[PDB]
Amino acid sequence: VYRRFLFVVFTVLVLLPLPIVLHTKEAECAYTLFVVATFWLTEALPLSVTALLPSLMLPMFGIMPSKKVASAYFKDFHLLLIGVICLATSIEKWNLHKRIALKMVMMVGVNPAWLTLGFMSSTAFLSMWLSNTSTAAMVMPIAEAVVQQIINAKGHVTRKLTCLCIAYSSTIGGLTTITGTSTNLIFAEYFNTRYPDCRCLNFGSWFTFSFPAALIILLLSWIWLQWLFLIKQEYQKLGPIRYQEIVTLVLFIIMALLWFSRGFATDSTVALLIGLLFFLIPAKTLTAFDYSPLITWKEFQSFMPWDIAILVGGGFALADGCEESGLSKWIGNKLSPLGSLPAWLIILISSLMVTSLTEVASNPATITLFLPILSPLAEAIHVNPLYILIPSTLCTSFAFLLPVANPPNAIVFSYGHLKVIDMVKAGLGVNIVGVAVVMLGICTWIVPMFDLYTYPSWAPA
Amino acid sequence: VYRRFLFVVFTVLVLLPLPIVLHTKEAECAYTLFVVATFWLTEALPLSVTALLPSLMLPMFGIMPSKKVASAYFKDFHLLLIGVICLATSIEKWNLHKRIALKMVMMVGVNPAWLTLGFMSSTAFLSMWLSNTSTAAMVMPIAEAVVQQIINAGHVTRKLTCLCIAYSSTIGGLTTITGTSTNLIFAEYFNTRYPDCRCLNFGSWFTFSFPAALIILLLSWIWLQWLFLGIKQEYQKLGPIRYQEIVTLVLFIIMALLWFSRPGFATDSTVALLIGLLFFLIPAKTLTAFDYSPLITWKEFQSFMPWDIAILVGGGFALADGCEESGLSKWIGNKLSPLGSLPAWLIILISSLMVTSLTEVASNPATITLFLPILSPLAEAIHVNPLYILIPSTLCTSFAFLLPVANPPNAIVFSYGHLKVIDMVKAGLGVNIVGVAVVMLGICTWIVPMFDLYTYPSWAPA
Ligand SMILES: CC(C)CCC[C@@H](C)[C@H]1CC[C@H]2[C@@H]3CC=C4C[C@@H](O)CC[C@]4(C)[C@H]3CC[C@]12C
Ligand SMILES: CC(C)CCC[C@@H](C)[C@H]1CC[C@H]2[C@@H]3CC=C4C[C@@H](O)CC[C@]4(C)[C@H]3CC[C@]12C
Ligand code: NA
Ligand code: NA
């Protein structure tokens, strides 16, 4: 009774017994550690309120920030993210993302079973640019209407096979771009901090090592999903193609051709030069007296992730706060026999610990907690840091079990079908295929790309 | 004909004849100067798109950023602004700001002419916390309904009440560093460039400017009432006082009592985050039940927070440092060497009158962004305290009281029926001269013993 308020009686709870430790300087900093890590996993607070808590609690105990090295008022990853969001804002303001999801399904829709590959290929291409949650929330109304008019010409299992294709291929196409999922932005913001001399990570080199990785997972999970389970009038009611979709489509082909083919030759120059045209090209008249452009600043501010910059800096103030106190030395002495395992065994034992924790917690929470653990470990045992951080930001996205992990597969669970055991039987095939393909990747073709066997010059010592 | 598109045929225009200069390294950097300054004043682009233009154009010519000194992932002014916005988010989500605007008018509403002072005192107190544009857009529906039921018991009392809402929303917009938006561009420019100064917080901006605005508020009521003329049922239809307004009002008195009365946790940004982050936690609604919702959500907080101020400041720094890497700051620095022979007080009068005149035709964040990296190099060169010049120029930026294109407070009240354009010029020139004279009286007598304005400090370089 009265456990409809289980957020407030838990946040107020956790701060009460945890002040057993009030005794020294490392016990007070470990109090901030087990509180912010607790509210990130259970998500009792909205994940950026919690990132402001080390900026409040640590000066109260007497642990002040002391880092004083930065540069560059506008960073290069911040200007790439500006130009990508303003392309992804007008592509769904003007409903261009339903033309493509219908035209791709129509082309390869011979449908013995090529409808399923038609649905996966249409929502994995849309996840490279849009967010995973917003692109699964519009193919799912489309696919439910198509599969109802097909059965209006056995029928139960083809409704929950089509459900899992939308939820799983929105995540597989969520990688292959550093701006596809949100957890590819926390990796890229942690890496341009802490390692600001590294120039090996841009838009056109994340796509080259991960598009061969996801095409194998996409083609092998279609075969797995189709195994264990078994429209011209829908495109006609979108209307004719408008003016504001031809302009958006032309700037989308122009921008993506220069990213892969190309001090002004950086990828953040193409993002701002073609991205800032969306604030300029006229779209509507509003009688006339004054036009309106393709996107406005109030719509751009709605789509931009501002909470990622608070989440990264809140993870840095917690990590540096453990270094000023004696906590990083104290647990560093009890874990000295960890540096006797081989380099490949650290990869397998960590990527299986991240692909298992991401099923019960959100993906930006488990990439924020684990990324300042593996990167000190990689410099200590004299490994290239990208050799450990690349297969852990890729196995974070592999959240394919029970529908509390990522909000893609909680949308498709909100429909009628697809009880919980249908995800565990289907997700364990895509999970094992996903881990084995990335483990195959960092042994053969990723190593000659980023020079993963040679300790670089951006790592300290 | 076809000049309904005068934005796109002007932005595309200005970039065409201005590449006469393509010849050297300072001529290419002055090309970026006269483009970004042109789109800030005319506002052909939304004022943060333009701040990203020196981050695009300057690496193309070969002028790279080279500054490498900062600290402190979260700054102290950023944590004060977080806690203020989440108090100003729930105060208008739950309509607490109409209780106060009606209860203050009701109390001093004897109305021979105390209705006018009742309206100014209710919308100047609400501008210390809310934004100037959003607090003039809700007293103006209220005052038009009250002045219509008073005349139903007459033309010049409709446009006297209009100008009280537009002018006292700006006078109460100062006295807080988070009241207007141009008090945030001053405070963000000053914690950059001068990071050793600890003299500027919430509780010392209010002490030097609340005596400055109370004199301008009390003297412009006398001026406005002169040149123009010599409600329990409106409060009853708000309903009874709810649950979510008593909780917001209690945390508003708690937070403001500790700001003025108070190892390293005794700062003003601690009170802002400790009482501000309770608005994400206290339950407000049930939504059947199975899961409550708090007083404010993160999607509503993200809507009210000014994110474009941090882009506008860093875009002004990349343009200012870009002129220093090239030879432009030395080239115009040699042609302006006889400027450093005027007295210290004459620089104040000649600059505050140049900023209070330009802010009538351009927006206030555009004229504080262009002028703040001009006066602060000038104050270090002629050996003056930099706060002695920057304080009376961030205060005369807000004095936009003439024709209704200056600030969006007095374009809202112009959008109603009354108040033709000459009624603002006759009324605004009285509030303008009173405003400049009170700040000039302030920086001579009581502001100087507060910030030590005659002694060159230790945070300025040399
Ligand atoms: C973000 C928060 C958790 C930082 C605190 C993380 C602790 C767990 C991290 C910080 C420092 C890390 C240690 C850095 C140093 C060493 C010594 C090396 O031979 C083994 C790795 C080991 C032992 C790392 C283990 C993990 C570690 C101790
Ligand atoms: C933001 C942009 C405009 C920066 C370029 C501004 C130019 C106008 C600013 C930058 C440097 C400034 C100069 C700094 C040095 C001097 C020499 C001193 O005896 C007179 C002031 C004077 C001459 C300043 C005048 C204004 C100035 C030249
Ligand atoms: Na995505
Ligand atoms: Na205000």
Residue numbers in the entry:
A (entry chain B): 9 to 161, 232 to 308, 333 to 364, 381 to 405, 415 to 588
B (entry chain A): 9 to 161, 233 to 309, 333 to 364, 380 to 405, 415 to 588
Sentences from the paper on this structure:
The solute carrier 13 (SLC13) family comprises electrogenic sodium ion–coupled anion cotransporters, segregating into sodium ion–sulfate cotransporters (NaSs) and sodium ion–di- and–tricarboxylate cotransporters (NaDCs). NaS1 and NaDC1 regulate sulfate homeostasis and oxidative metabolism, respectively. From an overall view, both the NaDC1 and NaS1 form a homodimer, and each protomer consists of 11 TMDs. The rest TMDs form the core domain that is responsible for substrate recognition and conformational change to complete the transport cycle.
